[PDB]
Design a protein around this ligand. Sequence first.
Ligand SMILES: C=C[C@]1(C)C[C@@H](OC(=O)CS[C@@H]2CC[C@@H](N)C[C@H]2O)[C@]2(C)[C@H](C)CC[C@]3(CCC(=O)[C@H]32)[C@@H](C)[C@@H]1O
Ligand SMILES: [Mg+2]
Ligand SMILES: [Mg+2]
Ligand SMILES: [Mg+2]
Ligand SMILES: [Mg+2]
Ligand SMILES: [Mg+2]
Ligand SMILES: [Mg+2]
Ligand SMILES: [Mg+2]
Ligand SMILES: [Mg+2]
Ligand SMILES: [Mg+2]
Ligand SMILES: [Mg+2]
Ligand SMILES: [Mg+2]
Ligand SMILES: [Mg+2]
Ligand SMILES: [Mg+2]
Ligand SMILES: [Mg+2]
Ligand SMILES: [Mg+2]
Ligand SMILES: [Mg+2]
Ligand SMILES: [Mg+2]
Ligand SMILES: [Mg+2]
Ligand SMILES: [Mg+2]
Ligand SMILES: [Mg+2]
Ligand SMILES: [Mg+2]
Ligand SMILES: [Mg+2]
Ligand SMILES: [Mg+2]
Ligand SMILES: [Mg+2]
Ligand SMILES: [Mg+2]
Ligand SMILES: [Mg+2]
Ligand SMILES: [Mg+2]
Ligand SMILES: [Mg+2]
Ligand SMILES: [Mg+2]
Ligand SMILES: [Mg+2]
Ligand SMILES: [Mg+2]
Ligand SMILES: [Mg+2]
Ligand SMILES: [Mg+2]
Ligand SMILES: [Mg+2]
Ligand SMILES: [Mg+2]
Ligand SMILES: [Mg+2]
Ligand SMILES: [Mg+2]
Ligand SMILES: [Mg+2]
Ligand SMILES: [Mg+2]
Ligand SMILES: [Mg+2]
Ligand SMILES: [Mg+2]
Ligand SMILES: [Mg+2]
Ligand SMILES: [Mg+2]
Ligand SMILES: [Mg+2]
Ligand SMILES: [Mg+2]
Ligand SMILES: [Mg+2]
Ligand SMILES: [Mn+2]
Ligand SMILES: [Mn+2]
Ligand SMILES: [Mn+2]
Ligand SMILES: [Mn+2]
Ligand SMILES: [Mn+2]
Ligand SMILES: [Mn+2]
Ligand SMILES: [Mn+2]
Ligand SMILES: [Mn+2]
Ligand SMILES: [Mn+2]
Ligand SMILES: [Mn+2]
Ligand SMILES: [Mn+2]
Ligand SMILES: [Mn+2]
Ligand SMILES: [Mn+2]
Ligand SMILES: [Mn+2]
Ligand SMILES: [Mn+2]
Ligand SMILES: [Mn+2]
Ligand SMILES: [Mn+2]
Ligand SMILES: [Mn+2]
Ligand SMILES: [Mn+2]
Ligand SMILES: [Mn+2]
Ligand SMILES: [Mn+2]
Ligand SMILES: [Mn+2]
Ligand SMILES: [Mn+2]
Ligand SMILES: [Mn+2]
Ligand SMILES: [Mn+2]
Ligand SMILES: [Mn+2]
Ligand SMILES: [Mn+2]
Ligand SMILES: [Mn+2]
Ligand SMILES: [Mn+2]
Ligand SMILES: [Mn+2]
Ligand SMILES: [Mn+2]
Ligand SMILES: [Mn+2]
Ligand SMILES: [Mn+2]
Ligand SMILES: [Mn+2]
Ligand SMILES: [Mn+2]
Ligand SMILES: [Mn+2]
Ligand SMILES: [Mn+2]
Ligand SMILES: [Mn+2]
Ligand SMILES: [Mn+2]
Ligand SMILES: [Mn+2]
Ligand SMILES: [Mn+2]
Ligand SMILES: [Mn+2]
Ligand SMILES: [Mn+2]
Ligand SMILES: [Mn+2]
Ligand SMILES: [Mn+2]
Ligand SMILES: [Mn+2]
Ligand SMILES: [Mn+2]
Ligand SMILES: [Mn+2]
Ligand SMILES: [Mn+2]
Ligand SMILES: [Mn+2]
Ligand SMILES: [Mn+2]
Ligand SMILES: [Mn+2]
Ligand SMILES: [Mn+2]
Ligand SMILES: [Mn+2]
Ligand SMILES: [Mn+2]
Ligand SMILES: [Mn+2]
Ligand SMILES: [Mn+2]
Ligand SMILES: [Mn+2]
Ligand SMILES: [Mn+2]
Ligand SMILES: [Mn+2]
Ligand SMILES: [Mn+2]
Ligand SMILES: [Mn+2]
Ligand SMILES: [Mn+2]
Ligand SMILES: [Mn+2]
Ligand SMILES: [Mn+2]
Lengths: 131, 60, 45
Amino acid sequence: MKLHELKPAEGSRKERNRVGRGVATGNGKTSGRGHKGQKARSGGGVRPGFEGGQLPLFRRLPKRGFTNINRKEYAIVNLDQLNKFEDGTEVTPALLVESGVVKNEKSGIKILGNGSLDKKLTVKAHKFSAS
Amino acid sequence: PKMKTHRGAAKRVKRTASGQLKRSRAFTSHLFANKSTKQKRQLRKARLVSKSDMKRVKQL
Amino acid sequence: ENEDVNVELSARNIPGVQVTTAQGLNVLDITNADSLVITEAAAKK
RNA sequence: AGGACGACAUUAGACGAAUCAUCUGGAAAGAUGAAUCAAAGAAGGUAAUAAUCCUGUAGUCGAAAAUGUUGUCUCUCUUGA
RNA sequence: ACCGAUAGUGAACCAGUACCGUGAGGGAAAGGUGAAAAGCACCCCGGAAGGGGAGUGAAAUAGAACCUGAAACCGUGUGCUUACAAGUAGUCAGAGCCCGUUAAUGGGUGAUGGCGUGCCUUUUGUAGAAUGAACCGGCGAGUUACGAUUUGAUGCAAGGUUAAGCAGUAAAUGUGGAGCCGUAGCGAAAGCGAGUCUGAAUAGGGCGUUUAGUAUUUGGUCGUAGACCCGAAACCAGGUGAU
RNA sequence: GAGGGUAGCGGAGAAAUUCCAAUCGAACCUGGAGAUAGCUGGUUCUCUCCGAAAUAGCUUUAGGGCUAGCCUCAAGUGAUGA
RNA sequence: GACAAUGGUAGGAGAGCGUUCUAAGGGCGUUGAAGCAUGAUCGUAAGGACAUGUGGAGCGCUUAGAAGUGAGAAUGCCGGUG
RNA sequence: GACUCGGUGAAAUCAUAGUACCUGUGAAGAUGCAGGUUACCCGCGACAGGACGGAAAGACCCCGUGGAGCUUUACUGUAGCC
Ligand SMILES: C=C[C@]1(C)C[C@@H](OC(=O)CS[C@@H]2CC[C@@H](N)C[C@H]2O)[C@]2(C)[C@H](C)CC[C@]3(CCC(=O)[C@H]32)[C@@H](C)[C@@H]1O
Ligand SMILES: [Mg+2]
Ligand SMILES: [Mg+2]
Ligand SMILES: [Mg+2]
Ligand SMILES: [Mg+2]
Ligand SMILES: [Mg+2]
Ligand SMILES: [Mg+2]
Ligand SMILES: [Mg+2]
Ligand SMILES: [Mg+2]
Ligand SMILES: [Mg+2]
Ligand SMILES: [Mg+2]
Ligand SMILES: [Mg+2]
Ligand SMILES: [Mg+2]
Ligand SMILES: [Mg+2]
Ligand SMILES: [Mg+2]
Ligand SMILES: [Mg+2]
Ligand SMILES: [Mg+2]
Ligand SMILES: [Mg+2]
Ligand SMILES: [Mg+2]
Ligand SMILES: [Mg+2]
Ligand SMILES: [Mg+2]
Ligand SMILES: [Mg+2]
Ligand SMILES: [Mg+2]
Ligand SMILES: [Mg+2]
Ligand SMILES: [Mg+2]
Ligand SMILES: [Mg+2]
Ligand SMILES: [Mg+2]
Ligand SMILES: [Mg+2]
Ligand SMILES: [Mg+2]
Ligand SMILES: [Mg+2]
Ligand SMILES: [Mg+2]
Ligand SMILES: [Mg+2]
Ligand SMILES: [Mg+2]
Ligand SMILES: [Mg+2]
Ligand SMILES: [Mg+2]
Ligand SMILES: [Mg+2]
Ligand SMILES: [Mg+2]
Ligand SMILES: [Mg+2]
Ligand SMILES: [Mg+2]
Ligand SMILES: [Mg+2]
Ligand SMILES: [Mg+2]
Ligand SMILES: [Mg+2]
Ligand SMILES: [Mg+2]
Ligand SMILES: [Mg+2]
Ligand SMILES: [Mg+2]
Ligand SMILES: [Mg+2]
Ligand SMILES: [Mg+2]
Ligand SMILES: [Mn+2]
Ligand SMILES: [Mn+2]
Ligand SMILES: [Mn+2]
Ligand SMILES: [Mn+2]
Ligand SMILES: [Mn+2]
Ligand SMILES: [Mn+2]
Ligand SMILES: [Mn+2]
Ligand SMILES: [Mn+2]
Ligand SMILES: [Mn+2]
Ligand SMILES: [Mn+2]
Ligand SMILES: [Mn+2]
Ligand SMILES: [Mn+2]
Ligand SMILES: [Mn+2]
Ligand SMILES: [Mn+2]
Ligand SMILES: [Mn+2]
Ligand SMILES: [Mn+2]
Ligand SMILES: [Mn+2]
Ligand SMILES: [Mn+2]
Ligand SMILES: [Mn+2]
Ligand SMILES: [Mn+2]
Ligand SMILES: [Mn+2]
Ligand SMILES: [Mn+2]
Ligand SMILES: [Mn+2]
Ligand SMILES: [Mn+2]
Ligand SMILES: [Mn+2]
Ligand SMILES: [Mn+2]
Ligand SMILES: [Mn+2]
Ligand SMILES: [Mn+2]
Ligand SMILES: [Mn+2]
Ligand SMILES: [Mn+2]
Ligand SMILES: [Mn+2]
Ligand SMILES: [Mn+2]
Ligand SMILES: [Mn+2]
Ligand SMILES: [Mn+2]
Ligand SMILES: [Mn+2]
Ligand SMILES: [Mn+2]
Ligand SMILES: [Mn+2]
Ligand SMILES: [Mn+2]
Ligand SMILES: [Mn+2]
Ligand SMILES: [Mn+2]
Ligand SMILES: [Mn+2]
Ligand SMILES: [Mn+2]
Ligand SMILES: [Mn+2]
Ligand SMILES: [Mn+2]
Ligand SMILES: [Mn+2]
Ligand SMILES: [Mn+2]
Ligand SMILES: [Mn+2]
Ligand SMILES: [Mn+2]
Ligand SMILES: [Mn+2]
Ligand SMILES: [Mn+2]
Ligand SMILES: [Mn+2]
Ligand SMILES: [Mn+2]
Ligand SMILES: [Mn+2]
Ligand SMILES: [Mn+2]
Ligand SMILES: [Mn+2]
Ligand SMILES: [Mn+2]
Ligand SMILES: [Mn+2]
Ligand SMILES: [Mn+2]
Ligand SMILES: [Mn+2]
Ligand SMILES: [Mn+2]
Ligand SMILES: [Mn+2]
Ligand SMILES: [Mn+2]
Ligand SMILES: [Mn+2]
Ligand SMILES: [Mn+2]
Ligand SMILES: [Mn+2]
């Protein structure tokens, strides 16, 4: 890189298509023919003449939702929990420790809502916690 | 402008890639077809996700 | 300032080290991080 | 709830570094020779393309006056728990 | 990494001016001698216009209608050609005559022979008697912003990444971890969780687990915008008009 | 003939859709405004590789559109194709 | 070195030419730039040089960037001349 | 008035033109294609068969989920009146 010998990374960057500049180019109708390849061009947005983006409806929603840490809690050293917001977890509406993997440590699982299998494995090692 | 989400897709919910969908003829005229009636079950799109693609898509 | 007033000498340019552009650095052909500075750019990885 | 003593800024400006020769030319700022200044190699001009020819530029200085803004004294108004 | 006189203001010129309308209102065209006016003393033809000498100048084959001065179009000169011939005008073959180049199995013209119904558009199909264009010139149409998606590229990677703001010369650049996507899914939901939903079922079945993401970005495409460009008849609002 | 009055969702009409500044089934000007135009026309360099369709379904749809079908580019499967 | 493939409209995909601006490098220019004209020149194409005349002051080249980037047709707009 | 001379000097049109006829052919009525037939070059005064002559993006007709004016026991309104 010597500023008069700049060379952009291989396979990045490719010349934009320019429609409507000639015929040999392969684009002078530009594209379409006769139809609504007119300028306004509205297809409609997503439709035919028979609306199938609608059949019936099913819905509701209340407040809830937690944040999952799997029994791959076997990363950290010993004792403690919730602190690991400084190690490996980010946004938490509330922090639940699920099962999955297989525990390899003895440590306090101070958290809100413990998944059952995970509780059996964490307790099979040593520590447990709640709230 | 961020595209507006279609709100008439309060009618599907994202699976993993594919959208789970409502069905058929629930409510009205139940006086007809009986094995038909046990068609409480899901859907997707296939041919149609091509059409509806980016509208129910801030539904991630 | 002063060292910086080696300014109007055509080819020369002279910034800090918390300065240090990607360009100025390689329009450059030769550099001379002084010593303190060399140690700081070394410190600010 | 209106007015007396000076700082700075606005409205003219001043200072401001260092190049000569030959070739070609209608004319050189170009070319080739030797030089020089630089807190000034921004820019524009001069018979072609000028850091040192000119207007300037870095920098420094500057206000009788008239607003302008503020530092602090005066001036008022004040019994707070 | 805005225009450079058909551009850029409507207006680089004494532009809201000539001009048009009763009025509200509409609205142009038109920049460039030269370094310096040194802007052609004098003689000549001519009433003058204009010109040829002689001069200024580097240049007037820069002379004022002035830099450069393309094309249509108009002329003078002519080397080859043409008055028994039926022509989309060329192409292929070819004698004769004239010439001599970016020197190469050269250039101009062309008796005669073969073949041969322009282009665009639009069409099932156009020599078409379907559309368009008198000619030459200039000017004239897929853009940008923001979101989405996808591919390529690059950095990290169970993680990736900052926004506003503060700092800095309208900076590549340090700060800022609010935020966002991802490491878990399933159900309308309560909720449960490598599983969950339906289900009386520890059946069957649906979605799901067997880890790769995420930020920036070239290209493709979509959305929101006038969203390739030119064109209505018309609607509405506020004025101006009974000369 | 002179001076006046009535003005556009209005005026005036011995009535004809008649006149309102040289085309009045609703004047003129400016704006909204780049109204909208599934219609028509136009859309500017080159070569290389592949290469359609004018069909079905639904459509206030029928010279428009959508999904399929046919084209291409790219991954992937791998003898399933003729 | 053999051996295959290479008509093509809508349309997909690929490689490129030329224009203006910018960055960096490297050059040309009053002993004549650009432009204009003329030529029997070069490359598969878009397109590139060269020599001469005109002109009288600016311009190429490499590599990368970015575009008001390419006209023959719109009863297109403006000018000129038939 | 036309026509001859002197003076002055437009226009609509126009893809380029060296622009014959018959019988065919053909997008089904051909200066331009085939096969024949005819025809030396260039004007002037005249005629109106053809150039589907010029002029006006057909007014009839159909189409567009165009416009506008009008009607009514079409729909929904509303100024006003009881
Ligand atoms: C367009 C018409 C005319 C002048 C005559 C036309 O007559 C009509 O159309 C009669 S409709 C009449 C027309 C005026 C309307 N305002 C009222 C309405 O009643 C006629 C006779 C044909 C039937 C059609 C073709 C024709 C070619 C030669 C010919 O014989 C012509 C067209 C091309 C021609 O230009
Ligand atoms: Mg719905
Ligand atoms: Mg001399
Ligand atoms: Mg300085
Ligand atoms: Mg200078
Ligand atoms: Mg006017
Ligand atoms: Mg008027
Ligand atoms: Mg007018
Ligand atoms: Mg001349
Ligand atoms: Mg002659
Ligand atoms: Mg010869
Ligand atoms: Mg001949
Ligand atoms: Mg011949
Ligand atoms: Mg033919
Ligand atoms: Mg014309
Ligand atoms: Mg862009
Ligand atoms: Mg990637
Ligand atoms: Mg990556
Ligand atoms: Mg993109
Ligand atoms: Mg707008
Ligand atoms: Mg109104
Ligand atoms: Mg009167
Ligand atoms: Mg009045
Ligand atoms: Mg009345
Ligand atoms: Mg409409
Ligand atoms: Mg239609
Ligand atoms: Mg394959
Ligand atoms: Mg060039
Ligand atoms: Mg040269
Ligand atoms: Mg000379
Ligand atoms: Mg010639
Ligand atoms: Mg040439
Ligand atoms: Mg010369
Ligand atoms: Mg030359
Ligand atoms: Mg000069
Ligand atoms: Mg050069
Ligand atoms: Mg580039
Ligand atoms: Mg034209
Ligand atoms: Mg015309
Ligand atoms: Mg004209
Ligand atoms: Mg007479
Ligand atoms: Mg004319
Ligand atoms: Mg004749
Ligand atoms: Mg026809
Ligand atoms: Mg016939
Ligand atoms: Mg109709
Ligand atoms: Mg009322
Ligand atoms: Mn390309
Ligand atoms: Mn094509
Ligand atoms: Mn078209
Ligand atoms: Mn189409
Ligand atoms: Mn289009
Ligand atoms: Mn439009
Ligand atoms: Mn819709
Ligand atoms: Mn969910
Ligand atoms: Mn049935
Ligand atoms: Mn001075
Ligand atoms: Mn000086
Ligand atoms: Mn000198
Ligand atoms: Mn100069
Ligand atoms: Mn100063
Ligand atoms: Mn202008
Ligand atoms: Mn010009
Ligand atoms: Mn007037
Ligand atoms: Mn001058
Ligand atoms: Mn003379
Ligand atoms: Mn002289
Ligand atoms: Mn002239
Ligand atoms: Mn000049
Ligand atoms: Mn001239
Ligand atoms: Mn003869
Ligand atoms: Mn014939
Ligand atoms: Mn030949
Ligand atoms: Mn023939
Ligand atoms: Mn074309
Ligand atoms: Mn035609
Ligand atoms: Mn004809
Ligand atoms: Mn037509
Ligand atoms: Mn025409
Ligand atoms: Mn033209
Ligand atoms: Mn700041
Ligand atoms: Mn089960
Ligand atoms: Mn299961
Ligand atoms: Mn399963
Ligand atoms: Mn885009
Ligand atoms: Mn699409
Ligand atoms: Mn678009
Ligand atoms: Mn009537
Ligand atoms: Mn009438
Ligand atoms: Mn009357
Ligand atoms: Mn009238
Ligand atoms: Mn009207
Ligand atoms: Mn509007
Ligand atoms: Mn319009
Ligand atoms: Mn093929
Ligand atoms: Mn059916
Ligand atoms: Mn319907
Ligand atoms: Mn069609
Ligand atoms: Mn088989
Ligand atoms: Mn091919
Ligand atoms: Mn072939
Ligand atoms: Mn393409
Ligand atoms: Mn240039
Ligand atoms: Mn353009
Ligand atoms: Mn006469
Ligand atoms: Mn004849
Ligand atoms: Mn034919
Ligand atoms: Mn026939
Ligand atoms: Mn015939
Ligand atoms: Mn005659
Ligand atoms: Mn007559
Ligand atoms: Mn028509």
